[PDB]
Amino acid sequence: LIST
Amino acid sequence: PDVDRFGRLPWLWITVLVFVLDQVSKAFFQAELSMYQQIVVIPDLFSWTLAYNTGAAFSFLADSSGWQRWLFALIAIVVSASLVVWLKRLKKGETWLAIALALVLGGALGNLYDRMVLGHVVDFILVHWQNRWYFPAFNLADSAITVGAVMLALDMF
Ligand SMILES: CCCCCCCC/C=C\CCCCCCCC(=O)OC[C@H](O)CO
Ligand SMILES: CCCCCCCC/C=C\CCCCCCCC(=O)OC[C@H](O)CO
Ligand SMILES: CCCCCCCC/C=C\CCCCCCCC(=O)OC[C@H](O)CO
C-alpha cells in the first residue's frame, strides 16, 4: 500500500 | 433519525478526506519542483523534494523492472475491498476502530491512483540528518497508512  | 439508515458508512468521509488532501499535495510539488530539486526548510533536518518511486526497493525479486506498478496496485485493491466490509460490520460505538479503518483506506487509494494513472508514486517529504543518513521520501498517503496501522496494533490494550 505505501509508496516504496 | 436518518443516520441509523446507513449504519457506520458515513465514516468513509474520513477516507474521502484523506484522498483529496493527498492528491492536492502531490499536484503542488510536481509543478513547483524539478526532479530531485530540494527546497530547504531546515538546513540539516527537513526539506521538500520531488521523487518518483518505481518500487526499486524490491528490485531484487525479478530480472526486470516495471512489474511493481501492477503488483502493488493489485494488492491495494484486495485490501481496500476487505476494509469496507470490515467497517460495515463494526458495531455502533466502536469509534477507535472506525476512525482507524478509514485512515488506512484513504492512504491506500491515494497511492493506488498514482500507480494506475502515472507510472510511479509521487513523494515529496525528505527527512534527514546532515549528510550521514537520508530517510526515504514519502507523502501524506503514507502518513495516513502508518497512523491508521498504529491504531490497529494498540487496539486491544
Ligand atoms: C488522526 C490524525 C491524522 C493522522 C494522519 C496525519 C498525521 C501526521 C502526523 C504524523 C504522522 C507521521 C507519519 C510518518 C510516516 C513515515 C513512514 C512512512 O511514511 O513510510 C515510508 C514509506 O514506506 C517509504 O516509501
Ligand atoms: C476527485 C475525487 C472526488 C471524490 C468524491 C467523488 C464523489 C463521491 C460521491 C458519492 C460517493 C460517496 C462515497 C462515500 C460514501 C460515504 C457514505 C455515505 O454516503 O453516507 C451516507 C450519508 O450521506 C452520510 O451522512
Ligand atoms: C474517494 C475517491 C476514491 C478514489 C479511488 C481510487 C481511484 C481508483 C483508481 C483509478 C481510477 C481510474 C482508472 C483508470 C484506468 C486506468 C487503465 C489502466 O490500466 O492503465 C492504463 C495505462 O495508462 C496504459 O495506457
Author numbering:
A (entry chain E): 201 to 204
B (entry chain A): 2 to 158
What did the paper state?
Responding to this critical need, we introduce here a fully automated method for collecting, selecting, and merging data from hundreds to thousands of in meso-grown microcrystals. This approach boosts the collective phasing signal of many tiny crystals to a level where de novo phasing of highly challenging membrane protein targets becomes not only possible but also fast and high-throughput. We refer to it as the in meso in situ serial crystallography—experimental phasing (IMISX-EP) method. IMISX-EP has three components: (1) in meso crystallization (and in situ soaking where appropriate), (2) fast, automated grid scanning, and serial data collection in situ, and (3) real-time data processing and selection of data sets followed by structure solution.
The first demonstration of IMISX-EP was carried out using the most popular experimental phasing method, SAD phasing, with the Se-Met labeled proteins, PepTSt and LspA. The average Se-Met incorporation was estimated at 59% based on the refined Se anomalous scattering signal.
